[PDB]
Amino acid sequence: QCVTVEAPINIAFIKYWGKREGGETLILPTNDSFSITLSASPFRSKTSVELRDDIETDTLRLNGTEVDVGKTPRVQSMLLHLRSTCPEELKNKKVNIVSENNFPTAAGMASSASGYCAMSAALIRAFKSTTNVSMLARLGSGSACRSAFGGFVIWNKGEKPDGSDCVATQFVDETHWPEIQVMCAVLKGAQKDVSSTKGMQQSLKTSPLMKKRISETVPERMKIASRAIKARDFATFAEIAMLESDDLQEICATTEPKITYATEDSYAMIRLVKAYNAKKGRTALAYTFDAGANCFLFVLKEDLPEAVAMLMEHFPTPFEKFFFGDRELLEKVKVVSLPDEYKKLIDHPKKPFEMLLQSPVGCGVKYLGPSESLIPP
Known about the structure:
- The chain is α+β, with helices and mostly antiparallel strands.
- The chain is built from ten helices and 15 strands.
- Helix 6 (210-231) runs antiparallel to helix 7.
């Protein structure tokens, strides 16, 4: 019919960084990755699609602006695969695609992941394609493939050159570990640098650290993270996430030319989390960065109010810039009396985050009703 879908972003704790030989068009990675799917509230991508006979080409509208599909190869790629895996009666139809998102502008959220996932799911429903949401989304953006499921999601690298086993699978769902929470402390970006798509191949070509990462490290950490998530062992999970984040920044730093997405605010956040955990005597709080300056944080619900109070001492941010999925949890932040031990943990200029997002582990994609369509009757 006319189909409308909302999809959430996700955050990789075991990083995707590099496409393998034969993988630049099909989007086949050098290693597995592993992410947490976030809530689609308050922020999400939304796509509406309508199959048409009246029209002579496919159309795509992004953020209210019509775009040339012939100039958008990732979307052409999805559409080719889609039409080779759908009924002869629908093969020939053209489609109007209308996509938007409500992420704050300039915040640098990974809204392409959510956008391609929402478009994949809407297209597959509309065309009655036999392909799965994850594999079609992968064609649009690698990380989109992990937004297809709620919970903790593995993108399996596969071994088949045609990509038929390169797909995300749900490791555990959102009900497995309800205590774990995700935040994003949005920071101003660094000087513009190469795109993730281009940079990751430059790293693969030039960083001396990639060989051992692909061969030894990711396989090791996939096993350790899987065990930790099954056991709900936050400290081990947190440790893997920070090791992975550190490694991607080191990979970027040892790429030629050097790639820098982190700012000194990013680095101060790393120091702050470390100093907090040191003062606490345990790994209470984890950071991860993903090819940008924003600091994602993982923390258990019980620990979140203190953690957020500690952050505000160093990066005082008005509540108007908090976007919490969990209102009750926000109210708990407001009453924390932060111990003096957690003040002045680092030396860094005080400034607000651009915003502070909180999410539980999310449920994944949602199909919406004709009322919510971006395509009017």
